[model samples]
Every structure is written in structure tokens, then in C-alpha cells.
Target: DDGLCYEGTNCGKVGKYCCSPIGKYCVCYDSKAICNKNCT
Candidate 1:
């Protein structure tokens, strides 16, 4: 699907990580070499 949904929750900070059902505000990975296992 698209991504996480934060509809009615009151999070004071915008970019900070707080809540349930969340997605990539930022994506962090150890390596991109093994994309099939890592990325998927």
C-alpha cells in the first residue's frame, strides 16, 4: 500500500517518531548491497 496513517492522534512534534501505524518519515538501512533480502 501507500504508508502509515496518523489521522486523529495529537503528536506535538511533526518529524519526531511518536505513534502507532507509522512509516518512513526517514528510511535507514545498514547496506544496499543485498537489496533483495534487505530492501524487500
Candidate 2:
């Protein structure tokens, strides 16, 4: 699922979604259900 992040809720705060501070959102890796690396 496409992740979501907002104020107070940071990336990787939920499960395996990664943080996109620039866009203030969360994203996953290509062809993967979860972001294993660089997730914070």
C-alpha cells in the first residue's frame, strides 16, 4: 500500500515504509512490499 506521513507522524513510524521528508510522506521500495533499507 502507498504509505502516508504527516505532522508528528514520520516515515518508518508505521511498518516498512520509508520517509520522504522533502515531500512529507512515506514510500516503499520498487517491486517490494516493504522498504528494508534507509527506512527511518
Candidate 3:
């Protein structure tokens, strides 16, 4: 499958985090790391 849908919603912003779904957005262990477990 392609990685298009795995892109994380930017929770850095206020509302972005509030509205994110389970598979919709995920915070990484680090800022430098990709949002998803395998976004790369």
C-alpha cells in the first residue's frame, strides 16, 4: 500500500490534535522521526 493516508495530522497546532482520529494521526517518539510508525 502507498503512504499517502498515513500522513500525521499536525498536532503542534491546537485544534489539529483534538480532531485527529486513531489511524488519522499519531505522535512520534521524536520530532525528527516520522509521525507514523512507518511513514517513511
Best by TM-score: 2
Query: How much lDDT does each candidate structure score?
Result: 0.32, 0.41, 0.36
How well is each residue in 7-37 modelled by candidate 1, as lDDT tens digits?
Answer: 2224442433232334434332333222222
**Selected candidate, larger lDDT, 1 vs 3:** 3
Candidate 3 residue runs with Cα over 4 Å from true position: 4-9, 13-23, 36-40
Candidate 3 is scored at a TM of 0.17
Would you list the rank order by lDDT, best first?
2, 3, 1
TM-score of each: 0.17, 0.19, 0.17
Top-lDDT candidate index: 2
lDDT of 3 by residue, 8-32 (tens): 3455533222222454644433323
| lDDT of residue 4 for candidate 2 | 36
Per-residue lDDT of model 2, residues 1-40, tens digit only: 3343333334434433344546544654432334433334
What is the alpha-carbon lDDT for the whole of candidate 3?
Answer: 0.36
The better-scoring model by TM-score among 2 and 3 is 2
